[PDB]
Design a protein around this ligand. Sequence first.
Ligand SMILES: Nc1ncnc2c1ncn2[C@@H]1O[C@H](COP(=O)(O)O)[C@@H](OP(=O)(O)O)[C@H]1O
Ligand SMILES: C[C@]12CC[C@@H]3c4ccc(O)cc4CC[C@H]3[C@@H]1CC[C@@H]2O
Length: 288
Amino acid sequence: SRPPLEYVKGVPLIKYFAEALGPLQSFQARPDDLLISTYPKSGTTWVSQILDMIYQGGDLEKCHRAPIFMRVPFLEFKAPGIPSGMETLKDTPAPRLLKTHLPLALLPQTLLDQKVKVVYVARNAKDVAVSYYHFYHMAKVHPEPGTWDSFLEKFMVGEVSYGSWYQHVQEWWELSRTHPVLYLFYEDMKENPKREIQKILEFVGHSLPEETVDFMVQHTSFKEMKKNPMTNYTTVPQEFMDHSISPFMRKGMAGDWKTTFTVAQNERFDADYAEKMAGCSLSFRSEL
Ligand SMILES: Nc1ncnc2c1ncn2[C@@H]1O[C@H](COP(=O)(O)O)[C@@H](OP(=O)(O)O)[C@H]1O
Ligand SMILES: C[C@]12CC[C@@H]3c4ccc(O)cc4CC[C@H]3[C@@H]1CC[C@@H]2O
């Protein structure tokens, strides 16, 4: 029950994912692949749906062909009895959309060699932290979260699945100076989706009718993605994800962190944060 994390090259990984890193060393990326990269709980499921929808030419029905995680293979994914993303990936027709949360240290080198385009989504740390906490309770493969207070503690030192969020956002921020990486912010997508969805289109080449963009905007909203079983993850074994404790689609909001963080925590955290994001131009909005 609740296996513990396995460290690989300094990164804490879910046992099953750590295992998957081996076959993964055989992954050959295609020049037309598109990688969705994010630190967990930063809008991955959200941007995947937008991308898939764009790829299907705005066709809602085609996007309903199967579970978002089947449509957009999860690269380092592996679970007992379930087909690894690697497996699933050889059954996937190009152009392909792939997702990952792995830090550069562990990113299959083939994707950089093949100069594969990257859509990266970042989210303010406080919200990611609250979100990850609840996610740790409902996604059975993670270790015990404990109290929210001890978790925040773990979070700060990077002792959580996929490690430091601080390092994660900075390293991909850096990568973007020399690699094709569209770096988006969750908060911006919340503020003005249509504006962000446009940036994505420009970045991936495709170009659709304003009448089409608005259609997506509606369909890739929290309300809509919450009820759609092809994106809310309510279609996976209750053993893996128990939505009754906390649903995958929880709130969908920027700023929800204020109702969980205490004043003590908020104080300790901002002190620690000022240190870790020192000489970095990266900047985050914590509300709105
Ligand atoms: N279309 C959408 N618009 C806004 N937030 C969304 C969304 N789809 C999912 N989310 C939220 O984004 C986070 C996505 O997690 P992941 O990065 O693993 O896909 C969760 O955050 P909350 O738990 O704060 O709601 C989820 O509920
Ligand atoms: C909970 C699982 C491991 C963690 C996976 C994850 C991990 C991080 C994240 O941001 C999103 C997801 C979506 C699918 C999750 C998986 C569903 C099956 C597996 O047990």
